[PDB]
Amino acid sequence: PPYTVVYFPVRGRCAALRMLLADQGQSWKEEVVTVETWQEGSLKASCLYGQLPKFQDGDLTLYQSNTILRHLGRTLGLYGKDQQEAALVDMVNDGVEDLRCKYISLIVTNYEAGKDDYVKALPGQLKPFETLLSQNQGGKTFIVGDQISFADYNLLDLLLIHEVLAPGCLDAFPLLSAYVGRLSARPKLKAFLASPEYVNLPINGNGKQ
C-alpha cells in the first residue's frame, strides 16, 4: 500500500479485487476515468496494454485484473496452504475468467440476440463450481481448502452478476446458493456490498446487465 484503483465508473473487472480488499480490512483510493477522458487518449497511450484497470500498490504499478487478484492473493496470504492448493486456486480462477469473458462478450457485443442461448447454456457453465464445492468439505467452507482465496472473491462476483442476468440461475445449485449467502454475510464484505461505493456503480458500462 497505499492502494489505488484506476478504472471506469463501473463494477466490471474491479468488482472482485475491491471485495477482496474490503473483506481483508484494506483501504484504497478510487481514481475514476470517464469515457470522455479515456477518449482524449493520453492515459490510454500510457497503459501497458492500452486498457484499464490500472492498480497502484505503493511504487508498484500493475495492469491486468487477474494479475491484481494474484498479487493481492500472494501478498495477503489468499492463495491456498500448499503449492497444490495454489494450483487448484488458479484452476478455479481461470474457470471464472473464461465464463467472465463469455459474459462480457454477451453484454458488449450481442445482448439482445445472444441472451436466450447464453441462459440455456448457463447451468452447464455453473455446474463445475458446484462440483468443486461438493468435493471440498461438503461445500461448507471455500472453493479451495479451508481458507478464503482470491478465487473466492472472483467466483462470488461472477455468481452475483449472473443472478442479475438470470434471476434464479443458482436455485438448482444448493452449494453455490448457500456459498453466495455465507460469503456475502462476512461482516466487512457485507458492509462493503451495502455501501454507496459498490451500490451506486453499474455492473457494466453500456447500461446492460
Ligand X SMILES: C=C(CC)C(=O)c1ccc(OCC(=O)O)c(Cl)c1Cl
Name every residue whose Cβ is closer than 8 Å to that of residue 15 and which is 6 or more positions away in sequence.
157, 160, 161, 203
Q: Which residue is nearest to ligand X (CB)?
A: 205
Residue 179: which of 145, 155, 195 has the closest Cα?
155
Question: Which of 11, 13, 18, 70 is in the footprint of ligand GSH by CB under 6 A?
Answer: 13
Residue from 21, 23, 54, 65 that binds ligand GSH (CB under 6 A)? 65
Contact between 51 and ligand GSH per CB under 6 A = yes
Per rule CB under 8 A, is residue 67 in the interface with its own copies?
A: yes
Among 22, 66, 155, 161, binds ligand GSH (CB under 6 A): 66
Nearest-approach distance from CB 44 to ligand X, in angstroms? 9
Alpha helices in 49-203 (DSSP H): 65-75, 83-109, 111-134, 150-165, 174-184, 187-194, 196-199
Among 5, 30, 56, 23, which Cα is nearest to 197's? 30
**Of Ca ion, ligand X, its own copies, none, which one sits near residue 171, judging by CB under 5 to 8 A according to partner kind?**
Ca ion
Distance, CA of 29 to CA of 5 (rounded, Å)? 6
- For strands 60-63 and 54-57, give the pairing: antiparallel
Per the annotation, does 7 bind a ligand? yes
CB 17 within 8 A of CB 5: yes
Sites of contact with its own copies (CB under 8 A): 48-50, 60, 62-64, 66-67, 70-71, 74-75, 83-84, 86-87, 90-91, 94-95, 98, 101, 124, 128, 131-132
Sites of contact with Ca ion (CB under 5 A): 77, 147, 171
- Residues annotated within the binding site are 7, 13, 38, 44, 51-52, 64-65
